[PDB]
Amino acid sequence: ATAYTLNLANPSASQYSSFLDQIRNNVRDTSLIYGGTDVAVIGAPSTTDKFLRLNFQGPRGTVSLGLRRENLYVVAYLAMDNANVNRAYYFKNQITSAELTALFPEVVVANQKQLEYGEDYQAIEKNAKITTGDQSRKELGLGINLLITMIDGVNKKVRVVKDEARFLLIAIQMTAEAARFRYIQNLVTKNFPNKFDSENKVIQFQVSWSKISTAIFGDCKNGVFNKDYDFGFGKVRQAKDLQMGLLKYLGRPKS
């Protein structure tokens, strides 16, 4: 599969932004214009190019994440164990053994292992064993330095579910969610490269991806919604106020 790399040995705000735009440009169909806006839209499903590889390159090793091109959902990750041997962990309802070999060719078939829990946030959060606040992903925070610390929990280490789950929660939000929402991208660059607090607004955006994409696709004219909408953080009438980065595929515009 095609692969893009994020250098965490010498990080910079400009490089992080370029990384996110490479993801957006790879999966979008430039001929799709939703609600008269200039926001990128994911193209229709394909069988000739199903996955995308993202490499987190560090001074002491590289950890990789695999995503599905049709919706940016997570399918698997790659990391060396305590014996320095490469291993792959995957969600079975998302990818097959042969496809996994093409995605991560440095991992032999015998070292491919199925994950014992679902890829929905609720299931991953339970295994993360967070003990303060509402115990959800929000309590961990966000940021480049945080991604670096969480990667250390899986790079060249014996697998521990608690640490694996915490790594996945931050890796998914710093790639897929940041690609979908410029509000999240902007928080990361403003605070670069530090760890910082998350917000209720961040979570409200994430749970509303389908609803937001649907409103722009069928109830918006030249960037203006036909009625008021509230996704949790306030009333909105102009699509631009949502600062979207990538919309969900819902078909081609009518008329």
Domains of the chain in start order, with CATH, are: 1-181 (3.40.420.10), 182-255 (4.10.470.10)
79 conformational bin, left if phi > 0, alpha if psi -120 to 50, beta if neither: beta
For β-strands 2-7 and 74-80, DSSP reports them as unpaired
Judge whether 199 and 205 are in contact, CB under 8 Å: no
Query: Which has the closest alpha carbon to 65: 177, 141, 158, 140?
Result: 177
What is the strand order of the sheet 235-238 is part of?
A: 220-221, 224-230, 235-238
Residue 66, burial from CB neighbour count under 10 angstroms (0-12, 13-18, 19+)? buried
According to DSSP, residue 249 is labeled P
Experimental method: X-ray
Judge whether 247 and 28 are in contact, CB under 8 Å: no
Judge whether 51 and 239 are in contact, CB under 8 Å: no
According to DSSP, residue 100 is labeled H
Q: How far apart are CA 209 and CA 202, in angstroms?
A: 11
The values of phi and psi at residue 112, to 5°, are: -100, 120
Buried b (16+ CB within 10 A) or exposed e, 150-186: bbebbbeeeeeeebbbbbbbbbbbbbbbbbbbbbbbe
222 conformational bin, left if phi > 0, alpha if psi -120 to 50, beta if neither: left
Q: How far apart are CA 193 and CA 143, in angstroms?
A: 7
Question: Which residues make beta-bridge pairs with 57?
Answer: 7, 62
Instruction: Reply yes or no: is the peptide bond before residue 193 cis, omega within 30 of 0.
Output: yes
Q: How far apart are CA 227 and CA 216, in angstroms?
A: 11
- Establish how many alpha carbons lie within 13 A of residue 220's alpha carbon, considering only the half-sphere containing its beta carbon: 24
- Which residues, at least 6 apart from 166, have a Cβ–Cβ distance to it below 8 Å? 128, 140, 150, 153
Q: How far apart are CA 245 and CA 179, in angstroms?
A: 6
Residue positions annotated with a catalytic role: 177
According to DSSP, residue 95 is labeled -
- Which residues, at least 6 apart from 123, have a Cβ–Cβ distance to it below 8 Å? 117
Buried b (16+ CB within 10 A) or exposed e, 190-225: ebbbebbebeebbbebbebbeebbbbbbeebeeeeb
Q: How far apart are CA 166 and CA 249, in angstroms?
A: 29
Residue whose entry in the numeric block shows the structure tokens 């697998």: 159
Q: How far apart are CA 115 and CA 87, in angstroms?
A: 12
Judge whether 78 and 88 are in contact, CB under 8 Å: yes
Query: Which has the closest alpha carbon to 169: 195, 208, 136, 196?
Result: 136
Judge whether 53 and 64 are in contact, CB under 8 Å: yes
- Which residues, at least 6 apart from 112, have a Cβ–Cβ distance to it below 8 Å? 87, 88, 90, 97, 100, 101
Please give the resolution of this entry in Å, rounded to 1 decimal: 1.4
Q: How far apart are CA 130 and CA 122, in angstroms?
A: 12
The values of phi and psi at residue 75, to 5°, are: -125, -25
The values of phi and psi at residue 225, to 5°, are: -65, 145
Residue whose entry in the numeric block shows the structure tokens 């394909």: 46
Judge whether 90 and 67 are in contact, CB under 8 Å: no
Residue 137, burial from CB neighbour count under 10 angstroms (0-12, 13-18, 19+)? buried
Residue 47 CB coordination number (10 Å)? 5
Q: What residue type is assigned to position 49 of the chain?
A: D
